[PDB]
Design a protein around this ligand. Structure first.
Ligand code: A1IY0
Ligand code: ZN
Lengths: 78, 334, 104, 91, 97, 100, 83, 105, 94
DNA sequence: GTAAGGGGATCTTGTATATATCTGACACGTGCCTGGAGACTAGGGAGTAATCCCCTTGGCGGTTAAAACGCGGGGGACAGCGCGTACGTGCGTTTAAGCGGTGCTAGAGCTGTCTACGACCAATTGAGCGGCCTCGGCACCGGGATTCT
DNA sequence: AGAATCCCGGTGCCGAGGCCGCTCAATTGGTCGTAGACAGCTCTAGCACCGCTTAAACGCACGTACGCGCTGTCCCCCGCGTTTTAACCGCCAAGGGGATTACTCCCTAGTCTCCAGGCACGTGTCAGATATATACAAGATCCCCTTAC
């Protein structure tokens, strides 16, 4: 399901990052780093959800998990 | 991998330390000082045995070359006859010199104005004035060769002299013979006598060459005639020099020549030199006795040195008035 | 009559006192601490709103949106240092193109 | 639920009278206020604990503001806090 | 005609630096999130706010990483970015030992 | 020329690397560091006093910081096909790290 | 006596030793000034925080605990000096 | 048995940890099993660090642990290095490491 | 002077348990004390935050377990959880 | 016949290793006192059951824009070569850090008390929160005006 | 000349700002117990100076290996067109599970009494520091032997 992150999407993110030309071996590396990031954040969020004895992952669990890693996010109930 | 399953490093370290300490403390014991029970199976560790045996072999091989090696008088007198025959048959012979020749003058090897020329220098001069010896190369800085009477046109001290001052401002360059030394305040890159010249208007400089310095003068260290003579000569007679420094000059040995075409070298020095294997016939013993026996074999006389025979006094350039008190050594007088 | 009107601030003081009292910070709470709290918070929010309203005026709009807050925070150096680890939703990026990539 | 929408709107009409705001901006402002409150309160609690005290005065808040806010922001916030405290005490 | 290669690249840079919307489709990101999360606890549920927040955080992270990567690529006197630039940026940032 | 023994440029650099990576001591003389610390401090409060352990802690922290920064700078220098470290390497390391 | 221009007391060989411990083989000639500037900024920040901590407690001496607290406030925790 | 650490089979104090939890402004009430869990976890971590430190000390033919051995043990293990990632240990040094490109060819 | 508290008595007992013939110096003791204090502060703060999030006034062993899982990386977390559960079971049964 | 390139022996230098001498810090013992353990009481936090109405998951049919594929060409990456100079190696010279005393005094630390300040509890009234609305601010669609290529 | 982007005119539509009503949380008032402000004393560690011995900092010369500019190639990204696909929108169902309320046992705080574990102080002896003499491991150069010419 990581292949659903198409190549034009990575090109758009690179454009917003200021990048002019992109090599052809960049997309796989981007997929790897995104997978690692998502794994860590979702692991922490699921831990927080399990402690509260729930079955639904709320937005506050994501916010707390992000805050644990020093990636504070505003606009979702912080 | 599990943390507990990752405890294989403990067995690895145990086996490594066990084997290393065991082999070290087992092979460190001398066989001659070992008992039968502890020493019967010394050869079980074949690789250890050969490794330490080779290490010790090279150790006393390196050690054994650092002591005096001498020949009994019978072999010495046998060799001196062939050496005399070779020198008589020689056509173009050059003589290399080192620290061992002046050792008989109580000069240290690897105040100094009280030294005098020895018998070897007089023998060299007498050989030179008989056409037998043509060019002499030296590495000594004492200057006993100058006091011997050898003409400066046929010598080239490649490391300078302690009795000469030079001035480079003049287009042909100028030299001056000084009775006292100029070595008091000499260091690397600091070559300034700090003394008034004759008429140049500039302070003179010394002539000594230190390690890392490149020779540029031509008056005391002539680098043309020495190379020419070494190229043209067909025989070499080194005396009293270990040749651990002179071996670094390729043109002096004519190393570009094919090995058969190289001149034959007859080393006369106590220790072992790196040119030993190619020696036509090496002699072991004091060079003074060898030269005396050579002269006796050829029938040549024995020049005698006298304190009134020094040519340095005649050739000493007079110093500017008031400049004598700067130096703090013992001058040379007739 | 309110403790906020006794100091001139527009932010609540009783709410801040309750939050400091039941927030597990210390055994006792002073009398003037909520006034100091409200003063500093009011200063910060007023300054941020001033800068955001300026940036909204430069875009010919009468309302503030997260883009203008992002612009105000990112342009000013002090507020950029304060909110350095903060990600603002629907903020965007500051327009910036490197010169070496520009055509000659 | 409780929020600072009422007070932030008052400050907004104080600074820019002819300007409105949407809902997402108000939420971001609320999160900002909560974050700053937590930062200052925690720093003041640590300050009290280090010195073997049991109460949180205005001195704790002032030193927390000095240690947290950067540059001239700290100066102006400290001045406003002192002025407001003096006005509250006298009145 | 045919624009010389480089003009459309800057046009798109300006367009996407003067915008605020999201740059990844929503259904595929939700699918990837659920498939990742199924390896920690089966039969999980999500709210739309959780997936929206995850998307925002991920996009911000990727944009910042690309900025650092472009800086690293320029340092090496190039115009195009390579995987080694990403690796150097991630190692300096501390994300990798 | 009287040529003595001489190591090629690069041997002593690797020897020093090993020597200073096998040790734990401090690499800055104490008196100049203490003087610098007091000089910096005199711009916030006048006639201040310092404990010896305070200056020791400051030195330890500063040395650790500088060593880490130099490691990052060396990585940046290698990335650009060079061996020498130059100021732009330090600036890039600090910019990516999050400082400045 | 007032202190003035003591940053020159951090000598070039000391910077070379720090670089060698960092694994650096060749060094340019302009690195020393950059190193001095970076060190000055770091020390400025840490000492300002420590002075604030020591001034809150109505003291006249800066203690190692204040230095440790100031360092921990910047995410540079240090072990072995108390705490 | 009287001591609460002896009933739990630990070498770390339970009463001291309970008092520290109570007088720390963490919560209004503290349960009875929290000090035991905390003491067990802290004991596990300290023993795990100390074993590696002792091994590293024995590797150098020394019978006393010094800060260098602690630093070697911490930096040579992946998870202990991840835990203490932003910590500076006084008189510890660094791990020897030379980049391959700098070695003579 | 006043009595000062440290963890040297326990650390030394654990060391003699693991390596029965090894010593330790004073600087290493200080480093170990700082390590224990740091870990205590981290876990206690995380547990207090977890209690505040769920609107509870009590810190129990569930909070400590969740904080341990959040803060410890891997098999370290697994082994620490097992050890703590063993200790609490032995204490409660006896 | 000549010369360029590969490899073994050698010299040197810096680091590691074995042995003895000694000294200060780690480890063990003693006194004692303060903090932890034992026993009992009361009261509020938390667990358990029950109900509801919100919200998340699932399926379906269009449509339409975004993704995937092919192709050609040009600009950028990369190797290779020449050149100049900046940086490393080593030596002689000059300076200031480090050490061991000697002394003084500010200022940290501890003890007693005594009063002002913060916590607690009952009344009570108003400020802020949930629902509904209404009308304009901004997005959308289309024609033309300027603007880099 | 010419496509891409901003500028102006007219329309629509739902979201922000007001208005109503109400109910809990902030305000009043008094009381009581204890934290900390202040005075005082003491003793310890931080500051200041002095003399000296020596190792590290400093200045300089030389040369060489590295950084930088220039040129050529070739290949692999970018811009454009055409076909394929799946995301997004709007609609409709259904049950899980989050959220609130009521009630009851029991777990924890608080208090008093008593004893033993851990902390401050003291003493000794042994592990690591230091000096000294060897052993060896790697680097740098020379010269002989092999191969294309
Ligand atoms: C370019 C640098 C110049 N350095 C220097 N001038 C400052 O040049 C000379 C020269 O380089 C070197 C002298 O070398 P040497 O003359 O060969 O003396 P060496 O140490 O090697 O000993 C010679 C060997 O002869 C043996 N030997 C001693 N006594 C002997 C007697 N009486 N007879 C025969 N052989 C004798 C010795 O054992 C020794 O091995 O230093 C300056 S420095
Ligand atoms: Zn002249």
């Amino acid at each position: 399901n990581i292949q659903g992150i198409t190549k034009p999407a990575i090109r758009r993110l690179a454009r917003r990052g200021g990048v002019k030309r992109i090599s052809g071996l960049i997309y796989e590396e981007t997929r790897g780093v995104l997978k690692v990031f998502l794994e860590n954040v979702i692991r922490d969020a699921v831990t927080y959800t399990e402690h509260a004895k729930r079955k639904t992952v709320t937005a506050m669990d994501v916010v707390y998990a992000l805050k644990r890693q020093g990636r504070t996010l505003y606009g979702f109930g912080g | 991998e599990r943390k507990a399953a990752e405890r294989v490093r403990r067995l690895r370290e145990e086996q490594q330390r066990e084997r290393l300490r065991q082999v070290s403390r087992i092979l460190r014991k001398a066989a001659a000082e070992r008992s039968a029970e502890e020493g019967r199976l010394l050869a079980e560790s074949a690789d250890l045995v050969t490794e330490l045996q080779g290490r010790s072999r090279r150790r006393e091989g390196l050690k054994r070359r650092q002591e005096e090696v001498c020949d009994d008088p019978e072999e010495l007198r046998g060799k001196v006859r062939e050496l005399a025959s070779a020198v008589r048959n020689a056509k173009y012979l050059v003589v290399y010199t080192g620290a061992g020749i002046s050792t008989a003058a109580s000069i240290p090897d690897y105040d100094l104005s009280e030294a005098e020329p020895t018998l070897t220098h007089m023998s060299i001069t007498r050989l030179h004035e008989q056409k037998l010896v043509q060019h002499v190369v030296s590495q000594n800085c004492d200057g006993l060769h100058l006091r011997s009477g050898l003409p400066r046109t046929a010598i080239s001290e490649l490391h300078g002299n302690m009795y000469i001052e030079v001035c480079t401002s003049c287009v042909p360059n100028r030299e001056y013979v000084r009775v006292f030394d100029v070595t008091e305040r000499t260091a690397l890159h600091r070559h300034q006598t700090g003394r008034t010249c004759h008429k140049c208007g500039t302070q003179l400089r010394d002539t000594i060459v230190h390690f890392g310095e490149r020779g540029t003068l031509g008056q005391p260290l002539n680098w043309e005639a020495a190379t020419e003579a070494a190229s043209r000569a067909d025989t070499i007679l080194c005396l009293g020099s270990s040749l651990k420094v002179l071996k670094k000059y390729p043109r002096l040995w004519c190393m570009t020549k094919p090995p058969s075409r190289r001149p034959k070298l007859y080393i006369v020095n106590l220790q072992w030199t790196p040119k030993d294997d190619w020696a036509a016939l090496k002699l072991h013993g004091k060079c003074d006795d060898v030269m005396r026996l050579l002269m006796a074999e050829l029938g040549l006389e024995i020049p005698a040195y006298s304190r009134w025979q020094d040519p340095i006094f005649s050739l000493a350039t007079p110093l500017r008035a008031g400049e004598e008190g700067s130096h703090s050594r013992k001058s040379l007088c007739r | 009559k309110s403790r906020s009107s006794r100091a001139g601030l527009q932010f609540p003081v009783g709410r801040v006192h309750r939050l400091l009292r039941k927030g597990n910070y210390a055994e006792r709470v002073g009398a003037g601490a909520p006034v100091y709290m409200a003063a500093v918070l009011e200063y910060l929010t007023a300054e941020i709103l001033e800068l955001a309203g300026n940036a909204a005026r430069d875009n010919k709009k009468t309302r503030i949106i997260p883009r203008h807050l992002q612009l105000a925070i990112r342009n000013d150096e002090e507020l950029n240092k304060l909110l350095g680890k903060v990600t603002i939703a629907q903020g965007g990026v500051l327009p910036n193109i490197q010169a070496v990539l520009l055509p000659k | 639920k409780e929020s600072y929408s009422i007070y932030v709107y008052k400050v907004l009409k104080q600074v820019h009278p002819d300007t409105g705001i949407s809902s997402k901006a108000m939420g971001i402002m609320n999160s900002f206020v909560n974050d700053i409150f937590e930062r200052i309160a925690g720093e003041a609690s640590r300050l009290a604990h280090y010195n073997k005290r049991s109460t949180i005065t205005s001195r704790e808040i002032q030193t927390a503001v000095r240690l947290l806010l950067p540059g001239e922001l700290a100066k102006h916030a400290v001045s406003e806090g002192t002025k407001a405290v003096t006005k509250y005490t006298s009145a | 005609h045919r624009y010389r290669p480089g003009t459309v690249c800057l046009r798109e840079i300006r367009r996407y630096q003067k915008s605020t919307e999201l740059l990844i489709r929503k259904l595929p990101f939700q699918r990837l999130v659920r498939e990742i999360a199924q390896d920690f606890k089966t039969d999980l549920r999500f709210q739309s706010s959780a997936v929206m927040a995850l998307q925002e955080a991920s996009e911000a992270y990727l944009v910042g990483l690309f900025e650092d990567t472009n800086l690293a690529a320029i340092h090496a006197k190039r115009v195009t970015i390579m995987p080694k630039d990403i690796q150097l940026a991630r190692r300096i940032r501390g994300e990798r030992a």
